[model samples]
Target chain A: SGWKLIDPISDFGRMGIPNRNWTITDANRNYEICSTYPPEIVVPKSVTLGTVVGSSKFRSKERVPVLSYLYKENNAAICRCSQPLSGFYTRCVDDELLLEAISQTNPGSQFMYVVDTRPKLNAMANRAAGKGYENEDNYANIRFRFMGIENIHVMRSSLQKLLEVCELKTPTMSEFLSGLESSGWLRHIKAIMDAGIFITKAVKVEKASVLVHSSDGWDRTAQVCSVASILLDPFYRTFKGLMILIEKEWISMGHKFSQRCGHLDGDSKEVSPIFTQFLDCIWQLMEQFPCAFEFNENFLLEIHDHVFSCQFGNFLGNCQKDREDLRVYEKTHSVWPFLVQRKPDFRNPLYKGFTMYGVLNPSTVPYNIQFWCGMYNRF
Target chain B: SGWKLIDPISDFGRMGIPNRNWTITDANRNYEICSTYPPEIVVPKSVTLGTVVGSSKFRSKERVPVLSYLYKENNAAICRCSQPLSGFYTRCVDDELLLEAISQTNPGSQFMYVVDTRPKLNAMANRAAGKGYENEDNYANIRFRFMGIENIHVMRSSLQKLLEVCELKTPTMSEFLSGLESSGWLRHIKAIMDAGIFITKAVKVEKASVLVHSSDGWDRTAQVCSVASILLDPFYRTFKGLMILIEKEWISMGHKFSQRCGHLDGDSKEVSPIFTQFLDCIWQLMEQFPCAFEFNENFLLEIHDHVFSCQFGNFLGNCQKDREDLRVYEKTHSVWPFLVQRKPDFRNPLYKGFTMYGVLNPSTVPYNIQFWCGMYNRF
Candidate 1:
């Protein structure tokens, strides 16, 4: 019965037979529709009220609120709207909808933590001020954790300079060293590591349900959630599990890889190394805890390379919806098959297999940031 | 007792005790000496004999002949010299010396195969014409197999073009594809894979002792020997084994990595992707048989990146002598420690533990060549 609910066909809402208690609707525009509990059971209204802001083209189609199980363990839930949008003081109706949906999904809900990865505290504070409870008057019921990671634009400039210096006809050792230092990539890496620590601590240490988001709940959110998932779950340390986590969080959750990575067209100013930075942060963690990860540096490097190369259509788009629109799965070969074929070339020699869980040591986070010569050195 | 002979101190001829049957000589300027049988026990002079060729500067230092057991199984012996040098048709002296040394080392002598990796068949033939046998007949007991792989120069041009296109702001997919085709990298990869197959077959199928060499017995020779060793021995499949093999064959045996790779300075015309080509070939093999290798694609990519980056001093020079002269070991940090620290990042996911010997399947050689997007794609 557990496997049936998690099955790709059924979980994706393609089973065709719907339970009377739940409603299935295409909220995200992708073929995979979302399932939600009966409207009568959910909170009809909340304390703070305002219409949800965004595109209304699909509103008339009566799509169900998009909410789904975040991980295979079914411990947490992930959705698009967590905080009130569209106004500084007005609370968007979707916030209460999300809260009630999450409440119904995980019956024994204690106070939940909203992990906001945006660099600005003002935006989070404004949204928090507008939010109010459906029944309970206590504003302290839901905690807000601020993880101030800068936006993708800031990271792209630093990475671009480092890449430029690496391409010189005769790049000096100091140039490479200074490029990394001047670009502030090390600090960026530390921010990522910090996010991973926060998420892991929330999920594992405090035993709390954490919802990760940064603006659109994709870019920085994917990075934190994926890294945190790897730290908390041993399954994610395996190659298959790692790939699945990437597919679930980064790709499916709309990380804007095409715009950020400049996948098809190179002239896009929106292109950034957000994904690359995330992978680099993971590499730093892998360096500190060798046996914690199942895949190697090559796997991370391959994904980073493919983000620009576009040899496979899998990483060519901004999100899962974009990929589906382009018929990526049917039209182009995925990179996963190619990676799986050459499995041995990326294996870490020191791996002895997973023996225990919750193995991450918070004190061991690597501060000594080294240049990833493998990725940048052109010659 | 088994480990005693293979110990670095004893195996490298550091022991004070001298055997009456063999003489220790330091013909090469490198600290590691060579070992050979005594004049009385070795085969008597055969044809045009001068005291070989090259330098005699270290002859008086009385170093060992530098012969050592290949692999942990203690089956075959590998040394610097396999044939005589300097002659068009002069039957130089080292040929007979090599033959006698092999006979003495392996006692269960069947037949021996001299695997020449040079591209020109005529050059090998000319070198062979100058060689003489132990017996009165011209044809020596040692058989010659010409692998015919071009020198590093040819590989460099091809790799350079690929890198050039990758760096372009608007590199088209077709441009990248045609660049690889025009540069002849695909053909180079094929040649490497072919050499790997030949070396593996010689050791495992024919059950014959093989001697690998190119012009200087370094660049092309290292590629063939390392790949062949990985195919024949499961140890080489592991990350530690792969690094050790590279150190032993390429770095220790004299493959001018610094000059060829243009690590520190990129102005040298001698800079080539010979090592990169060798690694690319291994990646091809790893792609075909995922479970065969112990390490994954990242390990090869890391070595390739470090070849030019100079982040680690281990890959900074052309040969062991060059490294020693530059104080690479003492002054610079080795990449092994960094790699060892995060061993799981390089582990192969599909690797089942090593069970049996001789696991190579020749049919699995990849014929369809594709551009190495990881190395080429610059954006």
Candidate 2:
């Protein structure tokens, strides 16, 4: 493996990926395209053509291409963009080789995007960055989820090796999820898709693992996540190709696409339209490829306006932008933390001396968004 | 006056018009055309051109020719069209002169319709024929008013002389109208017109006498009389030219054409698109005059069906044909007589409990026709 981790001091302070200081410029910065880890960045054991570069460090004071490749495959890999704070490495691959393999293997002469599917909480953490809530424990769990990481004992040997190499805090990941469950937060990972809830209670299972879920994860969770994802990065796109591939491959492997669509019919009728649009945005980003490195800010702004207006503002007015000014940006990076704190108030009958019907249950998620958006307008 | 009363039939029948056998018939005998007055029909100088020819013989055979002319002006005034059982006639003018004047003045006119603008009792008695209520000395009053034939009196001398020459029972004609008032039938007439309830109450007034208005008088009263004239005829050809003249004259009188629209501005806030259509029917009838005379059997059938469905069939479904048949032909002819005999019942709530609403008033004349037609159909 020829990869290096550098202590880029200036880079850390300039745009701290995990901190509020990190200014995300891409409105269309969906995790679909940017976080896709390519092959050249993966560094296989067969790569004996050059210096066997083990973990090494490189620093740049000026405008120096952080990663570049000569071969098309490596170039594409190098070009795979990274989302702010997403821990997945920005890897470069030989584009020609990868594309050749794709064409030869795929009858349609189409190259599937070779991106890392390893779970990474960097983007997720950055999603919650600006406001406040991030602490050491949260950072540890985020790292555990990254790099094909799991909190299970089946990967104990790999986990032990990684622990030995990094000397990182080997916090029990199972205990973490269990802690989440005890906090009355339930965690249900349907597909690689995203979702959130107002009242995420942490719970501990008898199996020594932590589970986190909301009281009613059936609906409210999806809506809140949708609102958050849309508002966070306007240009954020959903990787439809990847999602389709994931769906196809999962089905081939006997996994249902239920996780992707969220319904038994494999159709989240209300949410599918918006979700499909997100996927289309990802396709656009992928089409831009190596040349454009990142989503154009102007393009993102255009999309931001379009999506905001269509998804909610067309009727509700531009609540997403206004929410940033009124409460979200001021509170913290992640809206989840704010919602978590206010879960009781949202559900409490006498929290504000009156019975509150605006509980953030799965049934009322859409209504909650509408209500909150409306309330935001008043402010 | 050349026209002399030569031993006038002393005992007129119960029906004011003469028996069908005595009345002369034209060889044409076209039941489609109206029964026109005999060319020799004459009127005394004291009466007007619009006076019915045979006052005593109007209900029977003599009623055909004269009433036919009144029913079908212009060419519809032929022998052997349908004739009501009884009718009214006056020695107001020469029949030949009257027909010629109407033909020349309003050629190609259809049947003229009277709005029945006189006080209500006169209208009721006209419908009643010569029949009078028991114990009511207003019998002659009913006949005179129903006839709507009065000699014009420019001064007291002319009035006295005219009454004496006509051999009117009352020395003063004013006493007749007064008698109507005293008989309590006047109150019944008011009730019939919904005098206080409806916005307007139309009264049927007499045409001017021959002395004041000549045989070919084209006066306002003459125009009104002309409307009544053609309405009784079955044929349209006779009155076609007259209706054209009448419609043209009506429109020329600075009468707002749009004002003829029915329910143009009905109070219903929720109006159907058919609003204009309904108004269009009224306007079309007024503008295209002959439509008034060319009454379609289909249209009458539709009305019959509507009345049968909405008002009559439910109650009269059990009635028989000869006894209670709703489909009998010439049902309308008997309707007026029945309405007339029970003159008080015209306004009697108890009686209308048997009849439909608005039947007593001439405006609702079609309703009675519908009722009998519906009853006829039941059998």
Candidate 3:
């Protein structure tokens, strides 16, 4: 409306923001300072056609990223493959490509077993149904068998609510016990334990190289694969070996730990105790076969503590690049060294040596799971 | 004959000694310093009927200074008891008292299996045999089964000779291999391995509380007990647990590391690789059950290094009292913390998690043991 009052000097010109009135001395000083600071390099994102970035093998190939023959020397090879969730731009075609790769890796194996660690009624089933066949499919000359677990989260909202209720007021022992009984955590624990048993059975009894995957192949996939590896190979039972397993499968492979663990920003909608669930599954196995693990429960608790605390930068981020960008190993003191030094504090007294085999029966799956005091008590 | 050379001093004393020339000031100063130092508390050897100094349950009780229920609460109760060797002040009466104590500690167990880890032909057997029941005895309602291992030492003279031979000139690979074969180390390794298997069998299969003893219960007793503990209990599989096991059983119980390890003063007639033999047994176990241990071969090697290097005062002493007097923990950094910090560097890549049990088959005991490169290579 005020079109007639157009000044010759605009707001910028009036403030001398363009530096047109700079003196020779000031300009020279500014130029010297600017020259000392190098220009930042901005690289554009390159095209990668649905290929997994950090896969050990088949990275450049069109096939999905799958690590086959993990412990080939021991004849206990477990495969880790990413799921082709349609919502995440990857189509069902990627699944076929994965099957082809699996066949190529494990020659003469007629069957390809996939431990689908996700709820059957949700996105998992939908993804499987979209693959031309039902839950069981024979694609690319490999018999694909999918085993689905209905519940996958570690601590459900109901259990958290029950625990919160106890925190509100110190309930009586019986009342607390009753609350725990009704928390529906037992079923969740059972699901995890059952998944471990199933995975073990697939590898040990069935003598099949299991391809474990869930959504994005990070959370549940890491859990089943690691658990199954522990079951199939004794090496994973060691403290160093377990750390390596977490590093290779969960951290390096991309588990969204920073977001899921809710380290920096606290809890959000995306946050869940996926790593804790994997640990819980391991605890169950340890309970059954006490002598197998080289480390005690303290090792797992230390890892859980570091996941939230960020005392060591190892578990600080979700992806490898994030860890590299943060300089986790270089800057932060590793928790392992500390844990190793004080290993006596974490040693399980009940551990008998390696003197039992084939003890992990499916029937031994834990129906009742206690709240992890290490995590909950801290809160 | 000397009566003619008698001086005026002979009037004071029949023997001509120069006592009159002593300085009173120097004598007084020496007396003052000695008084200030309290003359180094010369405790007279007290006679005790029978007393357990550091038993887990009955430390104050009169129960024959024994480490009972080593893996307490695990039910795999392995006891390390000092033998009432007659050569020492302990008589046959003390053996009967020890048997009584064993019964009291582990009730309803009729048999007290005593693994005499000493050369049968040595002075140890002579002392035991002279106790009136030959090698085997039934005293104080306890069946004592004595098993003797001959030539129980760590580094053999023959192995040393072979190593020395290699130093003379550059030996061919075939000659080196031949020297290794003829080094007579295989027998030593077999003896250690066999002893471990026997100890394991006593605890695991027979389900009896074994009383492991040798001459003075320091050298061979420490070796057998530590090895058997490793075999029987998986808690000892972790590096920290193992350190604790050694500290509790060997160091605290007085394994004479100074005399056995021979860190200072180099090799002497009294020096033996008894500790090294124990470590070698652990190595054999690690080889068989690759994933059972948390640390790789480096942990054992590091311990061996410290045994001779005296870098840490922990393994420097000959007895628990010696370690206490030296204040090893107070002055020195524990190798455990250092190793724990550098865990990745010492981690075995093949280690899976705790999965296989009963893999420690006694039949698979190593017969041919190679000279440890960690120790020999340094030479």
Better candidate by lDDT, 1 or 3: 1
DockQ of each candidate relative to the true complex: 0.02, 0.00, 0.01
Model 2 lDDT per residue over B61-175, tens place: 3322222122111222211111123224322223333323323222344222222223345434644774211111212111122222211111122223323333434222233
Best by lDDT: 1
TM-score of 1: 0.47
Candidate 3 per-residue lDDT, tens place, A1-379, comes to 1111221113113223233211111211222212211111000012122322222122111113344224342232355544543432333544456445544444435565665666655544455544212234425543354445443344546457556645745343334434544555545555656666676776566555566655455666667777666776565676656766676667655677888888765557667767877887777667555557777766887778787887776677766556666776677676656666777767655454444443345343121233454445454
1 versus 2: better TM-score goes to: 1
Model 2, first chain, TM-score of 0.16
What's the lDDT for candidate 1? 0.55
Query: Candidate 1: deviation at residue B362, Å?
Result: 5.1
Which order, best to worst by DockQ? 1, 3, 2
CA shift at B166, candidate 3, in angstroms? Answer: 4.1
Query: Residue B377 error for model 3, in Å?
Result: 1.7
Q: Which digits, one per residue and each the tens of the lDDT, describe model 1 over residues A1-379?
A: 1111112223323212233223433233333331111111111122121312131111212222233223324344333332334344333344444455443443345666666677655454545654311222322255766677787778878777766655655543334334445667666777777777776776555555665556545677677777776666676677766666666566655567778777665577777777787777777767666667777878888867776788876666775556656777777677776777788877775565876545475432222333454455321
**Residue lDDT tens for model 1, B335-370:** 776776677767787787677445576442122333
Interface RMSD of each: 18.6, 46.1, 28.5
Tens-digit lDDT string for candidate 2 (A40-159): 122222222221121111101111111211112111111111222213232223322322222232232122222222234432443454211112232212111122211112222322
- Residue B129 of model 2: what lDDT? 70
Q: lDDT ranking from best to worst?
A: 1, 3, 2
